[PDB]
Scaffold this active site. Structure first.
Site, short mmCIF file in Angstrom:
data_model
loop_
_atom_site.label_atom_id
_atom_site.label_comp_id
_atom_site.label_asym_id
_atom_site.label_seq_id
_atom_site.Cartn_x
_atom_site.Cartn_y
_atom_site.Cartn_z
N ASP A 426 25.29 46.36 43.98
CA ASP A 426 24.81 45.01 44.45
C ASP A 426 23.48 44.67 44.13
O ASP A 426 22.81 45.67 43.38
CB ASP A 426 24.82 45.14 46.21
CG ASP A 426 24.95 43.78 46.60
OD1 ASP A 426 25.28 42.57 45.98
OD2 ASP A 426 24.38 43.61 48.05
N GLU A 429 21.30 41.63 39.49
CA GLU A 429 20.86 40.67 38.57
C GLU A 429 19.51 40.90 37.75
O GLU A 429 19.47 40.28 36.62
CB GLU A 429 20.85 39.04 39.36
CG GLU A 429 22.10 38.97 39.78
CD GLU A 429 22.58 39.55 41.01
OE1 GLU A 429 23.90 39.72 41.28
OE2 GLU A 429 21.86 39.98 42.10
#
Ligand SMILES: *[C@@H]1O[C@H](CO)[C@@H](O[C@@H]2O[C@H](CO)[C@@H](O[C@@H]3O[C@H](CO)[C@@H](O)[C@H](O)[C@@H]3O)[C@H](O)[C@H]2NC(C)=O)[C@H](O)[C@H]1NC(C)=O
Ligand SMILES: *[C@@H]1O[C@H](CO[C@@H]2O[C@@H](C)[C@@H](O)[C@@H](O)[C@@H]2O)[C@@H](O[C@@H]2O[C@H](CO)[C@@H](O)[C@H](O)[C@H]2NC(C)=O)[C@H](O)[C@H]1NC(C)=O
Ligand SMILES: *[C@@H]1O[C@H](CO[C@@H]2O[C@@H](C)[C@@H](O)[C@@H](O)[C@@H]2O)[C@@H](O[C@@H]2O[C@H](CO)[C@@H](O)[C@H](O)[C@H]2NC(C)=O)[C@H](O)[C@H]1NC(C)=O
Ligand SMILES: *[C@@H]1O[C@H](CO)[C@@H](O[C@@H]2O[C@H](CO)[C@@H](O)[C@H](O)[C@H]2NC(C)=O)[C@H](O)[C@H]1NC(C)=O
Ligand SMILES: *[C@@H]1O[C@H](CO)[C@@H](O[C@@H]2O[C@H](CO)[C@@H](O)[C@H](O)[C@H]2NC(C)=O)[C@H](O)[C@H]1NC(C)=O
Ligand SMILES: OCC[C@]1(CO)NC[C@H](O)[C@@H](O)[C@@H]1O
Ligand SMILES: [Cl-]
Ligand SMILES: [Cl-]
Ligand SMILES: [Cl-]
Ligand SMILES: [Cl-]
Ligand SMILES: [Cl-]
EC number: 3.2.1.20
Length: 860
Positions: A426, A429
């Site tokens: 998770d 980015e």
């Protein structure tokens, strides 16, 4: 010179608000549109581009010099370029435009008789023109606009063959992208899915449909922040902030062939373990081993299948990777051992960013990361410090081979404590709670570039780390869009080394080629009817991009689900290739056992049907892995010559044969879906065993077969129903029930045989041990073809080995049998028993056969 049709105007002021005088000063045309939109400032046909010079032929293809004489309005034009054109296969054309004087950043990537394409060149202005040889259709034509090639701005345009274009993830969009002046931004960003936004992933690939049902694909191998601008002429512009132009054209001609050809470059999807296709259950807020164990107990008591129990941040010590707290999670190792003993697996969240604030020597992942120089560094060569869950954090550099070794060690050491079966990666980015770093970012051309794409927040720094930060291969500016992908590669390798069986990685952030290593979930979707509907095009989109192991959080992540929405979402979500129900910290519970009896029955039926179909879904994953096929596919991939399918994205196929027509709105008891030409059998006519209670059969009997001319059909769809139809001419393998794949894989199997009017059908089964590495290379699998013809069903043995030799076939259900047989034979002997239903045309046959031994079932 300024008489350019409005839809064919290319923006001469993409960089800033401009005045008529500034626009004309740039050598551009100023014409206000009569009411993103059509540019007021646009290039005349005479706007200076590059000139082609010294075109030359090589064995592979062509080389030339491109020369710009008049600078653009961007700084650092590269006035002399080199063009290389490589005719790589009959289906794949490859060209690059580079600076012959300087190595520029390039994405790291592993590499009648006539091509399907022809290529020609415009001299001045320069352009590449790619025709389809068969019909002369113009597929690429980069002459339509000037070539820009400056140090931080590349722009290449083309005409498009039609208004029908798909790809360019990740965005909340219909499957077919709007060509109405649409700006699509590729810059990996932590943001809850919302329209017009750059989301978690970036896939600079499109598939363009052509009148008649042929298609081609274009891949720009460029990982820089970029805008892709679609206009209604129709045309497309790639606008990148760095690197080079590295362009692949894939000639198809079939949409499924375009996808396979693209995956021949970026990689075929990885083969998941069989258990990974089971049901996954997670939330943020399972705050102890006791609560987590109650989830499995509550699912089991209510006869709900569950293969994989998950935890979010709850398990960690102070929200740190590779720890578990000694309060609620003191007995974490015992909980995971118990899951395994019951035939289940375990998954937990892993974040990339490592707590940097703990006393020296107290937190090995940071202390060892520091020693080995694994972290992204700033101007002064110290670790860039941001903020995520644990507080202050450093960010691993997964382009550094030493960081890969460190990540392998941290994973193996933690697995020695708690034997987790995969990683949920998770916030990759990478996500930053503050802008850039605790220390901000320097003022330089990477942080403040001359062209900022349409990113949320208006800066490359927003919700992430400084652009000018250092990684082993390059700056973060060039590598940002690869962060998640590099972590997925590092994690895939870590899990192979730790466990010695197939890895299972589910990643938020992705880039082109991610599917070779990992799967994806669509992130922080709202528990809304709009997000349920949006999940269908997004799952289809990821399948076209070679990430078939994809799904949305079932019942939705953010906010509170309703019972009705959770029934509908479980029904559709049971046809996500990756099926997980996951839920936010402050949300009302949404586990299947938390709803009313009627809602539980509908959810149990959806999970029962998915488990029954797992041999088939596993076989579709094998085809993805060996042949670059999609698993979940849009109707237009299977029936591209039927233009009525082109805008369909609220139905999906599994492979060639299973059509799923979900209800996607509140208060509906029916659904209207498109049925391509053919016969479609209602899968409800195939008997399926459940361990618990299912919904009562409907008050009114449903049509056993839809005989479609290629048309829209309104189907009954009460709350307890999802419409699933089986294409005539196909055979589906099924397997008996279980609460886990450990139990289901031991059950006898069945065939569903959907006959054509002419009595034909074909199907297949791939079977292996469900988890070993190198199965195909070692031949440790069984592969069987099923054929119906002239009132007979046979198997054809492609490969039979120990894995698959014991598979028991106990039921054959034949659909479209027009007349009651007088006899049914299995290997020449009248069967123990069969039923024929004259109303439904279903012949149901009990047999005692082996998938791995030649059989012949006949009726007359
Ligand atoms: C590159 O990253 C490093 C961290 O790895 C940054 O170091 C940080 O530097 C600032 C000052 O520029 C330090 O702030 C100081 O903290 C002390 C006491 O803790 C305080 O007395 C001072 O008034 C000041 O606030 C900060 O502590 C330090 N961070 C760490 C973790 O040591 C460095 O600034 C970065 N360089 C650039 C150019 O961004
Ligand atoms: C286009 O090419 C010409 C000729 O280049 C020569 O032949 C090539 C195949 C290769 O072997 C080159 O190394 C050769 O120089 C270029 O014109 C030449 O320019 C050079 C150096 O400036 C000069 O010494 C020669 O006299 C020129 N030759 C001729 C026949 O004019 C020309 O510069 C190239 N154009 C561009 C834009 O690069
Ligand atoms: C999601 O629902 C929670 C909880 O809602 C309450 O409890 C349920 C059983 C149901 O009966 C609801 O109608 C109840 O209101 C919401 O959190 C509550 O929010 C209110 C108002 O902000 C607050 O006063 C309560 O104390 C909260 N209750 C709890 C247990 O936390 C939450 O707002 C809902 N989320 C959204 C996005 O609407
Ligand atoms: C590729 O695009 C270019 C530019 O749009 C096309 O060239 C133009 O065609 C029009 C109409 O024939 C001419 O009047 C213009 O003078 C052309 N412009 C240039 C720059 O040459 C070209 O036809 C397209 N190529 C194909 C095969 O479609
Ligand atoms: C598992 O199911 C049990 C039983 O339904 C749940 O325990 C009940 O929770 C309610 C709150 O809704 C309490 O008021 C009761 O005291 C509990 N009943 C019993 C019989 O123990 C439990 O919460 C469920 N756990 C999870 C994680 O879903
Ligand atoms: O950010 C808060 C939610 C969460 C916590 O780990 N992180 C983002 C992920 O997308 C969620 O699934 C996950 O629950
Ligand atoms: Cl003005
Ligand atoms: Cl150790
Ligand atoms: Cl570089
Ligand atoms: Cl239509
Ligand atoms: Cl038999």
């Amino acid at each position: 010179q300024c008489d350019v049709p409005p839809n064919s105007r290319f923006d001469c002021a993409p960089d800033k608000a401009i005045t008529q005088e500034q626009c004309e000063a740039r050598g551009c045309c100023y014409i206000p549109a009569k009411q993103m939109g059509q540019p007021w400032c646009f290039f005349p046909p005479s706007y200076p581009s590059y000139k082609l010079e010294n075109l030359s032929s090589s064995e592979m293809g062509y080389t030339a010099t491109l020369t710009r004489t008049t600078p653009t309005f961007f700084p650092k034009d590269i006035l002399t370029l080199r063009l290389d054109v490589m005719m790589e296969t009959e289906n794949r054309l490859h060209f690059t435009i580079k600076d012959p004087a300087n190595r520029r950043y390039e994405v790291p990537l592993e590499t009648a008789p006539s091509p399907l394409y022809s290529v020609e060149f415009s001299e001045e202005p320069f352009g590449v023109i790619v025709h389809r040889q068969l019909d002369g259709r113009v597929l690429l034509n980069t002459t339509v606009a000037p070539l820009f090639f400056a140090d931080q701005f590349l722009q290449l345009s083309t005409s498009l063959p039609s208004q029908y274009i798909t790809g360019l993830a990740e965005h909340l969009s219909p499957l077919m992208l709007s060509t109405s002046w649409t700006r699509i931004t590729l810059w990996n960003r932590d943001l809850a899915p919302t329209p017009g936004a750059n989301l978690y992933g970036s896939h600079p690939f499109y598939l363009a449909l052509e009148d008649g049902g042929s298609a081609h694909g274009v891949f720009l191998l460029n990982s820089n922040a970029m805008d892709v601008v679609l206009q209604p002429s129709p045309a497309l512009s790639w606008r990148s902030t760095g690197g080079i132009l590295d362009v692949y054209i894939f000639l198809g001609p079939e949409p499924k062939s375009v996808v396979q050809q693209y995956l021949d470059v970026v990689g075929y999807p990885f083969m998941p373990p069989y258990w990974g296709l089971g049901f996954h259950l997670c939330r943020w807020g399972y705050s102890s081993t006791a609560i987590t164990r109650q989830v499995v107990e509550n699912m089991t008591r209510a006869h709900f299948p569950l293969d994989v129990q998950w935890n979010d941040l709850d398990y960690m010590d102070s929200r740190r990777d590779f720890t578990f707290n000694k309060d609620g999670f003191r007995d974490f190792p015992a909980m995971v051992q118990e899951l395994h003993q019951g035939g289940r697996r375990y998954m937990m969240i892993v974040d990339p960013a490592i707590s940097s604030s703990g006393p020296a020597g107290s937190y090995r992942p940071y202390d060892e990361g520091l020693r080995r120089g694994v972290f992204i560094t700033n101007e002064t060569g110290q670790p860039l410090i941001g903020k995520v869950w644990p507080g202050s954090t450093a960010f691993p550099d997964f382009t550094n081979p030493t960081a890969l070794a460190w990540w392998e060690d941290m994973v193996a050491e933690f697995h020695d404590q708690v034997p987790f079966d995969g990683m949920w990666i998770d916030m990759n980015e990478p996500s930053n709670f503050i802008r850039g770093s605790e220390d901000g970012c320097p003022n330089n051309e990477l942080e403040n570039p001359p062209y900022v794409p349409g990113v949320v927040g208006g800066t490359l720094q927003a919700a992430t780390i400084c652009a000018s930060s250092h990684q082993f291969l390059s700056t973060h500016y060039n590598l940002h869009n690869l962060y998640g992908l590099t972590e997925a590669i590092a994690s895939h390798r870590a899990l192979v080394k730790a466990r010695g069986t197939r890895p299972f990685v589910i990643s938020r952030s992705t880039f082109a080629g991610h599917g070779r290593y990992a799967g994806h979930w669509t992130g922080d979707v709202w528990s809304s009817w709009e997000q349920l509907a949006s999940s269908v095009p997004e799952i289809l989109q990821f399948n076209l991009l070679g990430v078939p192991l994809v799904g949305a959080d079932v019942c939705g992540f953010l906010g509170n689900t309703s019972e009705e929405l959770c029934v509908r979402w479980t029904q559709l979500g049971a046809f996500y290739p990756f099926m997980r129900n996951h839920n936010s910290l402050l949300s009302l519970p949404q586990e299947p056992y938390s709803f009313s009896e009627p809602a539980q029955q509908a959810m149990r039926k959806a999970l029962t049907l998915r488990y029954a179909l797992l041999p088939h879904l596993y076989t579709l994953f094998h085809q993805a892995h060996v042949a670059g096929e999609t698993v979940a596919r849009p109707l237009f991939l299977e029936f591209p010559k039927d233009s009525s399918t082109w805008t369909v994205d609220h139905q999906l196929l599994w492979g060639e044969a299973l059509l799923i027509t979900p209800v996607l709105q509140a208060g509906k008891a029916e659904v209207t879906g498109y049925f391509p030409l053919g016969t479609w059998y209602d899968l409800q006519t195939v008997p399926i065993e459940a361990l618990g209670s299912l919904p009562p059969p409907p008050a009114a009997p449903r049509e056993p077969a839809i005989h479609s001319e290629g048309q829209w059909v309104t189907l009954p769809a009460p709350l307890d129903t999802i419409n699933v139809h089986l294409r005539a001419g196909y055979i589906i393998p099924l397997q008996g029930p279980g609460l886990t794949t450990t139990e289901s894989r031991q059950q006898p199997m069945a065939l569903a045989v959907a006959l054509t009017k002419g009595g034909e059908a074909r199907g297949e089964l791939f079977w292996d041990d469900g988890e070993s590495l190198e199965v195909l290379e070692r031949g440790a699998y069984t592969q069987v073809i099923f054929l119906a013809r002239n009132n007979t069903i046979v198997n054809e043995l492609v490969r039979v080995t120990s894995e698959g030799a014991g598979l028991q076939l106990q039921k054959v259900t034949v659909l479209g049998v027009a007349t009651a047989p007088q006899q049914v034979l299995s290997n020449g002997v009248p069967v123990s028993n069969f039923t024929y239903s004259p109303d439904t045309k279903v012949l149901d046959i009990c047999v005692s056969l082996l998938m791995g031994e030649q059989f012949l079932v006949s009726w007359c």
